[PDB]
From a paper:
CaM is a bilobal protein, with each lobe consisting of two EF hands that adopt an open conformation upon binding Ca2+. Overall the cross-linking, pull-down and alphascreen experiments show that AKAP79 contains an unconventional 1-4-7-8 motif beginning at W79 that is principally responsible for Ca2+-dependent CaM binding, supported by a stretch of ~10 basic-rich amino acids following the motif.
Co-crystallization was achieved with a peptide corresponding to AKAP79 amino acids 77–92. Although only the C-lobes coordinate Ca2+, remarkably both CaM lobes engage the AKAP79 peptide (orange). Trp79 in AKAP79 (W79AKAP79) is deeply buried in a cleft within the CaM C-lobe, which is the canonical binding position for the first hydrophobic anchor amino acid. CaM adopts a highly compact conformation to accommodate AKAP79. Whereas positions 80–83 exhibit α-helical backbone geometry (diamonds), positions 84 and 85 possess more positive ψ angles that are characteristic of 310 helices (black triangles). Closer inspection of the CaM–AKAP79 peptide complex reveals that N-lobe H-bonds, involving residues including E7CaM, Q8CaM and E11CaM, enable CaM to accommodate the atypical AKAP79 helix.
Author numbering:
A (entry chain B): 2 to 55, 61 to 147
B (entry chain D): 78 to 88
């Protein structure tokens, strides 16, 4: 429906990682990076459309973009797109290394053991990595 | 452990 307080906090934390002087803006060239850190997988066309619909993007504009993407993208597609971003090398599995980088790029400071525990919770077939359906199982709850 | 990733999508 709309973004929760905890989603807003998480989006602000990711945005702020590219707002180096704290002035509430990122550059238009940084928008894609911030979106990908949040599990969005925008095409070049999608990014340029969002940029044109508003050389900087301020946080209220960004948050409005994110609220619309969250509400209007099909839920199954949202999961597919997030898996595609997080699976950095596209081999069909999120490795522990890839997942550590995802959590770091959100702005979190998880230990390596905490990320291993994320993997173990999701890993149903025991291969130590997270495939697409294992991700769906986590992300549908 | 997965709450921050789950928040990235809707159900
Ligand atoms: Ca991979
Ligand atoms: Ca697995």
């Amino acid at each position: 429906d709309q973004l929760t307080e905890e989603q807003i906090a998480e989006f602000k934390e990711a945005f702020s990682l590219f707002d180096k002087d704290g002035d509430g803006t990122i550059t238009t060239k940084e928008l894609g990076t911030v979106m990908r850190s949040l599990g969005q997988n925008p095409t070049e066309a999608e990014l340029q459309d969002m940029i044109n619909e508003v050389g900087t993007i301020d946080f209220p504009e960004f948050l409005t973009m994110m609220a619309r993407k969250m509400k209007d993208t099909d839920s199954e597609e949202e999961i597919r797109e997030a898996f595609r971003v997080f699976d950095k090398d596209g081999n069909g599995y999120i490795s522990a290394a890839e997942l550590r980088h995802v959590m770091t790029n959100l702005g979190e400071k998880l230990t390596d053991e905490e990320v291993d525990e994320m993997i173990r919770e999701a890993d149903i077939d025991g291969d130590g990595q997270v495939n697409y359906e294992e991700f769906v199982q986590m992300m549908t709850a | 452990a997965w709450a921050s990733l789950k928040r990235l999508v809707t159900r």
